[PDB]
Amino acid sequence: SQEVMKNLSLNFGKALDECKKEMTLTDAINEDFYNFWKEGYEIKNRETGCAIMCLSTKLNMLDPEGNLHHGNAMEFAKKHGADETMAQQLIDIVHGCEKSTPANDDKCIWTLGVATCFKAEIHKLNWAPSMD
Ligand SMILES: CCCCCCCCCCCCCCCCI
């Protein structure tokens, strides 16, 4: 559901401010988040990946390192309105994307790659929202 992807995006972004008084980042990132679900948009700023990883770690979906906590990621989805089957589809995609993106000590760059892959698969389902 697009409606459910919108609420998940909004709620994922609530932790963002805060991250900011904790990593201190820029208007390039706000532009990337604003554009995230636009078709064909490409994220080019490394520090957007840092933001996503900060966000996810604050929500307990990433560990110290960047392996997804599947259980906590399911719980986030369900918290913000995914039913069991949508949540399980989402986790599978993120897990597929971790497997497919190359190892990188640079976790900010690793995150961008996973997050690109994720966005792509969400478009393929027609679940990318108009953040409107
Ligand atoms: C399973 C829940 C996803 C919820 C919100 C999506 C918004 C954008 C962040 C998702 C991309 C994840 C990228 C790196 C893996 C850490 I979950």
Q: Ligand 1: does its nearest atom lie under 6 Å from the Cβ of 8?
A: yes
The angle at the Cα of 3, spanning 44 to 53, to the nearest 5 degrees, equals 35
CB burial of residue 19 (10 Å; 0-12, 13-18, 19+): buried
Helix and strand tally (H, E) in the chain? 7, 0
Nominal resolution (angstroms): 2.0
CATH level 3 topology of 1-132: Recoverin; domain 1 (1.10.238)
* 30 alpha carbon – ligand 1 mean position (Å): 16
- How many of the other CB atoms lie within 10 Å of CB of 77? 22
Q: How was this structure determined?
A: X-ray
* 56 alpha carbon – ligand 1 mean position (Å): 7
| Residue 15: DSSP 8-state | T
Query: Which atom of ligand 1 is least distant from the CA of 74?
Result: 1
Identify the sign of the CA torsion 52, 53, 58, 63: positive
Nearest-CA residue for atom 7 of ligand 1: 9
Residue at token pair 């919108």: 6
Integer Cα distance of 92 and 109 in angstroms: 21
Q: Residue 18 contacts by C-beta under 8 Å, 6 or more apart in sequence?
A: 58
